Amino acid sequence: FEPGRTRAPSLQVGG
Amino acid sequence: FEPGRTRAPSLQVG
Amino acid sequence: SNMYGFGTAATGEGSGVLFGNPHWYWKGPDRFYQAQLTIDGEANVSGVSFLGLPVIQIGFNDSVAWSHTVSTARRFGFFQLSLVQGEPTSYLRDGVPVKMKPATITVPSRNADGSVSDVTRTLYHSEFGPLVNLAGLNPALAWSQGTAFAIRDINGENFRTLRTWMRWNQAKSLDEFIAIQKEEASIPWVNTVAVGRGSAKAWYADIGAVPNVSPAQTAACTTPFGMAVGQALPNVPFFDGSRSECDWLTDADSVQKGAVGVSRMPSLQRDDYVGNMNDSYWLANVHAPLTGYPAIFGPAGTSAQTLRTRMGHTMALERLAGTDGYAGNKATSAVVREMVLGSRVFSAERFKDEVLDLICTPAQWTVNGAAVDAAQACAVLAAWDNRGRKDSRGSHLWDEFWSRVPTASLFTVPFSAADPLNTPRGINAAAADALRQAMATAIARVGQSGYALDAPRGEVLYATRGGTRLPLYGGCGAMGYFTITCSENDITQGGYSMDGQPNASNSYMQVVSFPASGVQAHTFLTFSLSDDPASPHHGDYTKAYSAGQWLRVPFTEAEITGNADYRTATVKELE
Amino acid sequence: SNMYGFGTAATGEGSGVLFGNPHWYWKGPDRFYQAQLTIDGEANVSGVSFLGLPVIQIGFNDSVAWSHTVSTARRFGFFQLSLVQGEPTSYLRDGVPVKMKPATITVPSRNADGSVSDVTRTLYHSEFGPLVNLAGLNPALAWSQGTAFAIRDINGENFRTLRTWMRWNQAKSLDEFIAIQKEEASIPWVNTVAVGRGSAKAWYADIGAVPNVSPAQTAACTTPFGMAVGQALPNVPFFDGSRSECDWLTDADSVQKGAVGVSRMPSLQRDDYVGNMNDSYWLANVHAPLTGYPAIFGPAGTSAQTLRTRMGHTMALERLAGTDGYAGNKATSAVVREMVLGSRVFSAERFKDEVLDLICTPAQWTVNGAAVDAAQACAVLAAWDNRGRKDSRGSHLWDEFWSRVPTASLFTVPFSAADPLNTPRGINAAAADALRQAMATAIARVGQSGYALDAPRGEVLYATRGGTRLPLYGGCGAMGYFTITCSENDITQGGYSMDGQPNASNSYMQVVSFPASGVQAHTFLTFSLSDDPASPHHGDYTKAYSAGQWLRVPFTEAEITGNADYRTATVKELE
Amino acid sequence: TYSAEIRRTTMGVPHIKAGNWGSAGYGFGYVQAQDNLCTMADSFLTYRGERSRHLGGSAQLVYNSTLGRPRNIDSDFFHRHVISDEAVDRTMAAQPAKLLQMVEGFAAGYNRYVREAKAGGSAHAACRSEAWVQPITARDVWRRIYAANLAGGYSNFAEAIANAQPP
Amino acid sequence: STYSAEIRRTTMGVPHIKAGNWGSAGYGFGYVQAQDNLCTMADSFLTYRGERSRHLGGSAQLVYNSTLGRPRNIDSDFFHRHVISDEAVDRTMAAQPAKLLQMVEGFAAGYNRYVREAKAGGSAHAACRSEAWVQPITARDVWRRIYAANLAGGYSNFAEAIANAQPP
């Protein structure tokens, strides 16, 4: 597992 | 191999 | 999204004032639609619905008014499924293999040549919910020969939502509103604030459908992957699907399997005010913080509030202190109407002078080895009123600058739970060069855009209707605006046009109060009723919003018939 | 891209005429830049470079003029690798494990908070070229335990290109131009058409760097995976890396290893004309087709030509037959300047009447169970001159319509190689409902764009300079335009604006001939020289293009110094 | 017999009046369609998973929403798999009587306007004659309803759900 | 020993460079190109050097469309570092005639001259002149760019796919 490769999704409904 | 999941790329230069 | 509930202590009248300010889509099916539903002996409700929805989601009746902001409470979780060897479509559950239910689906697809052919594939469910490709999140999270991932959304099993809005639409007092919310525990992804007739207190709550995990459980169930990706999914239960002790718990007062019990969900009553601007339940009221609720509802004072949240509460305190420039010290319908459009800019009010003092002497600079003249920029920003009103000059300069300031080590006074409105602050003197970099860029972007640095906001921020540009006011939450008019358009591509698909902005607005005569309500639907450019209701409401003229929406029968634009018609049909 | 070379028989004069018309980016580093290089007694050449390139790629000297169009010959192949068990970075070469070459690369990346941190990953090369991730092409084509994929581009080892253009820049006759092209065999992905002073025949050739594979190789070396995906990569060799027998071949007259030899590459010399519009070498000249060249170059008589190719050759033939509405029957410089801007629409010219005859009787329809009024639509199109000129009325309706017509069995008369310009033809009577469906939609798109159905194209198609919209002419290849001005902007997005990043369109244009007094060149740089909105040369050239006024570009010293806008300055510094 | 009085005041705000829930639905569905037909018609294509049929598989969603703008093919797959007949059934099975009627009325009211737009008029010239402006069912409204609940969970992972595939 | 070019501009600003040698020709050509198109060019050298991500962020798309398409900066950087490596530039330069090596040397020097001018002041290129990615370049960089132009038919079309080719 490489944290550098993590792509966080948008989690704000409406943002 | 399922042919229906094939996604042709951009081949014409320009 | 913002909302205020003021109690009779704050308003100094017989009832409180409700301010409903969802920031939402200007186009598409989720956009709001304003209407009134008068059902004989059953309901008389007014407010707003998503297109395609049949009950009022935000609004008021004769007795109660309410709104919603999106809540910080996570509404989903992941489940790590340990697959069976040789059988990648089956996952282990306490030693025994359990088969994932397939669904073979065929979708007709129009081909770029005109013809229509089928594309088919077979998707899957676990008992937790649908399977989910997480390679995008992280490559290592791919549906492998050893492991796979499923997502669960408690709302997937939530069927009480329409009933709840339906019952609120009928609700006959604040106490009844409260009890419905408590009974149904159904509210899917929003906070709720309400005010009732002849009720001193204003209501805040994040009571609804929320995943139920214990702190003990999250320590024992979070997988190594869950630990590794945990910060990208803050407070999202990334649990082990192999162990049944990791299944979402059910409290004794839990309305739904796997959801949180009603008494362990945050709520607050105040006779002065409750408010929320998208931060957690924590600061529903600044004077009386809420603490001691499940982690999943979000940080209760362990995180800096957003600039908008700081702006929001500040506005509420300074109103009641009578220090905001408005008359008196009460949150009356009339004052609230003006106040929420004032377009104050938190970042400017709090940090402009420090920034200007830090980088404007001298105003000729070297930035990345290059001569930059920032005298005009410095002077225009000094002269600017820190507001995004139609005739505020230089406000767009600030937008292009602030949104580019690097936030690492920006403030020297860190966030303090004791002082959440004034922390963090103190612009770091060591950031001088980065700030100059950001300002240089801002000057260039405005330069490309063809607007002068001192252009009035109204010419930069606009909605086009009937071939004409209506000047607008407000901005984005990032600059610490409360009044939200937030374009997705780059300044260089024709200014901050609101004609496309802008970011969540002021959409349906309402200020509701309850004088002796009966419910009064002032409203906006900023983009207007109709998506058809031929319709006379495509741009009328937007004209009013530009002019800042709240619409007193007729509610009683005499009010509806007495309206200057009253037209009635009747539609009927069999079945 | 389009180009013509006209011989002395086609012009009447002692020299031919060259028309260069590449369809290229309007913004970005590959955009053309117009200039003349004069190196004392070594070179005097004018034309155009990609931004960043130091020699002229398309242009002319006192002896030759040439242009390029993208060739249909594929320039790369894939190689499937059989991986060593246990070792997913090694592949077999005739039963022998070979190490792939690793490269560990770190790239600093600005994080959206301000700070800049390193991101590293190890990539690989095979003896064929870099490893390539083909999961995007098809998920089954991932890099697995036993399978991997490299890509080979012949230009990877082609270091001769820049040397070639330089030599062309200095060339003193067509003969030498052709000789240079044969010695170098370096032209990476384009056709070439050149005309020379005192030469009767115009020159055409796809003589450059092309992967060399035999028919025996194609059927024996294509892997199961290559078979399965061939249709997405037409004519692209997908070979078995395992076998040395599947390496690209070298001819006895090959300039490069693995490249097609010079004698087996398509060329033609004609005293009437040669032309190309992006189809294969086959129809370099309609009268004398070319055949028998290696398959990788594309089809030579088994495929229909594009509408743009059909338009181009039609224009050439009708010019020389004297049947195109211009004067005489000769391809003189003056006349060619008009015709190439003419903006004839092939689809309209050939099929409009057929379409309208079929669907406008009557002009009131029912489409999808809905009443549609096509009186205006039908009458505007019937009145339309089938051109995309500035004052052409209705041309945009046709664009919106034609590009939406389903092509499945649209034509009753199929492609014939003996009639390559006029087949396929004959609108299928059966298509009537599909045709009415497409027209209905077109009416609607133009409707909501706010343009009238009979709006003059000049108002729909434009480039904005100095705040004013310069009217434009031309259209997209899909509609059968030769004069190409092809917006990426949907008509509902404020018309066919050319201000963003348009699809390949007229960019650098030249009309070059060699009278007795010396070269004459008429040119356009449609988008103008400078990308700086402040520059005097951001919009001047574009203003001339809108007016269709060809620039007579000064070439001799006298012409340069004699020019009304003559400015000189000399720059210097130490070496 | 559905019957609702539609009163319009300034800015066009409709005020539906009916003697029962079904008829209120009938009025509300009608006015929403009357004012917003093109967006609504496009929207039911979305929730049903019928977008790729009309607008092509590779084209993105026309409008932004709590769904984001994924590709049509993936949106279609997501909606069929997650808002399936079973889910719609389970939804409906748990509804009070008046609400079920309201939704019936809503679909019939919406359908009334579609018939009117097909017949003629200069409203909604952008889509009024397109095949995807077509009647809908009570169940399709329920699809929409169910979909608005998923904003905080499944909606955010539409592409991701539509592409969950074993090795 | 000095670069020296006469720059003659005519209608539409069309520059006609006049020089005694190939190096000096390159110098003038490099100069006028930068003078008219600095922002595009500067951005573009980030592309060929694989330095996009440091300045513009890894997750943003290439600003301008080209033969390269518009992949993510991070992927673009890896593509160019991997494919247009030092060895590739070394192999490309080894093949060139002396006069071209000189012309490209001049071209870089001339481009760099304008960067010095733009950094110093003036109103031209207001959009980007203050930015850090407006910087001097080397001859090797121009060669990167030249090499990139050839790849249009093959590698350029699979840039993102080449930047992500790694074993399981």
Residue numbers in the entry:
A (entry chain B): 8 to 22
B (entry chain E): 8 to 21
C (entry chain C), D (entry chain F): 1 to 575
E (entry chain A): 12 to 178
F (entry chain D): 11 to 178
What does the published report state?
The recombinant MacQ protein exhibited bifunctional acylase activity against various ranges of AHLs and against multiple β-lactam antibiotics, including penicillin G, ampicillin, and amoxicillin. The MacQ protein is comprised of 806 amino acid residues, including an N-terminal signal peptide, and belongs to the N-terminal nucleophile (Ntn) hydrolase superfamily. AHL-acylase is one of the enzymes capable of inactivating AHLs via hydrolysis of the amide bond of the acyl side-chain to produce homoserine lactone (HSL) and fatty acid. The MacQ structure clearly revealed a typical Ntn-hydrolase fold comprised of a four-layered α-β-β-α motif45 mainly composed of two polypeptide chains, α- and β-chains, generated by self-cleaving activity.
The crystal structures of MacQ, both ligand-free and in complex with the reaction products of decanoic acid (C10) and phenyl acetic acid (PAA), were determined at 2.6 Å, 2.2 Å, and 1.75 Å resolution, respectively. First, electron density was observed for the SP lying in the vicinity of the active-site pocket. This was quite unexpected, because the SP was not found in any previously reported structures of penicillin G/cephalosporin/AHL-acylases and is believed to fall away in the course of the autoproteolytic maturation. The SP atoms were refined with full occupancy, while the B-factor values of the SP were relatively high compared to those of α- and β-chain, indicating increased conformational heterogeneity or a lower occupancy of the SP as compared to the α- and β-chains. Second, the crystal structure analysis revealed that MacQ forms a high oligomeric quaternary structure. The two heterodimers consisting of the α- and β-chain are arranged face-to-face, resulting in the formation of an approximately 170-kDa capsule-shaped molecule (dimer of heterodimer) containing two SP chains. The unit-cell of the P1 lattice contains two capsule-shaped molecules, which are identical and can be superimposed with a root mean squared (RMS) difference of 0.47 Å for 1512 Cα atoms. First, the SP is observed in all heterodimeric units of MacQ in the same conformation, both in the presence and absence of ligands. Second, the residues from Gln19SP to Gly22SP form a type-II β-turn structure together with ordered solvent molecules, and the main-chain atoms that form a peptide linkage between the Val20SP and Gly21SP lie at the entrance of the hydrophobic pocket, where the residues can interact with the HSL/6-APA moiety of the bound substrate.
